[PDB]
From Swiss-Prot, chains A, B:
Identification of the protein by name: Nickel and cobalt resistance protein CnrR
Keywords annotated in UniProt: Cobalt, Coiled coil, Nickel, Periplasm, Plasmid, Signal
Induction remarks: By nickel and cobalt.
Function text: CnrH alone is able to activate cnr expression, while both CnrY and CrnR (CnrX) are needed for nickel induction of CnrH. Has been suggested to bind nickel.
Shown residues within the full chain: 37 to 148 of 148
Segments in the Periplasmic topological domain: 1-112
């Protein structure tokens, strides 16, 4: 699948009042990081489209654009999962098992 | 976005009767290849979920599962685009510009 793992967690197992206060800095830093990597992904998609518009074949331009797309997609996947673990660190310990249930099930479905 | 590039092309710019005959072998070979890589992707998602169920932290198990997911996703992206170029080769030349319009626009939106 193509689930939004971060959104799934904040909606299904929302932070409590104190957890939200504790996590606010890291949540903002993540929002900014997600936006930056998504800007890079959109730009890489544009480069791949441009390459194929110019010459619709495998090509050095296509090879480079494909790699750039892959790299940005991987950076987003990894950054998201690191932030998911940041969230888990900021939870009261007793809230972690419910969080994990949602996380495990969503990962199995391909959410990222 | 998360568009299904292959499906977008076959639906918006379907093959004509003769093109469909010419392409049938390569279309079948691609269907089988897509299914194989998707099996690997689902299995990699399962390994990542398992890893995090066991120990919800970055870990050698998470590192390996994440890489396996990335590798299968890239293999699928590349195989799809190679087959898109197979399709273009099997088109009557006069049909290629319409195909390219759909392809370029869909790539720009992130379809893969
Ligand atoms: Cl929340
Ligand atoms: Cl809990
Ligand atoms: Cl078709
Ligand atoms: Cl045309
Ligand atoms: Co968060
Ligand atoms: Co096809
Ligand atoms: K993930
Ligand atoms: K692509």
């Amino acid at each position: 699948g193509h689930g939004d793992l971060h959104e799934i967690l904040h909606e299904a197992v929302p932070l409590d009042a104190n957890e939200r206060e504790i996590l606010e800095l890291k949540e903002d830093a993540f929002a900014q990081r997600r936006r930056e990597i998504e800007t890079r992904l959109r730009a890489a998609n544009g480069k791949l489209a441009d390459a194929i518009a110019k010459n619709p074949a495998w090509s050095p331009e296509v090879e480079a654009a494909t790699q750039e797309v892959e790299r940005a997609a991987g950076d987003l996947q990894r950054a998201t999962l690191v932030h998911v673990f940041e969230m888990r660190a900021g939870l009261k310990p007793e809230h972690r098992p419910a969080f994990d249930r949602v996380l495990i099930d969503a990962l199995r479905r391909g959410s990222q």
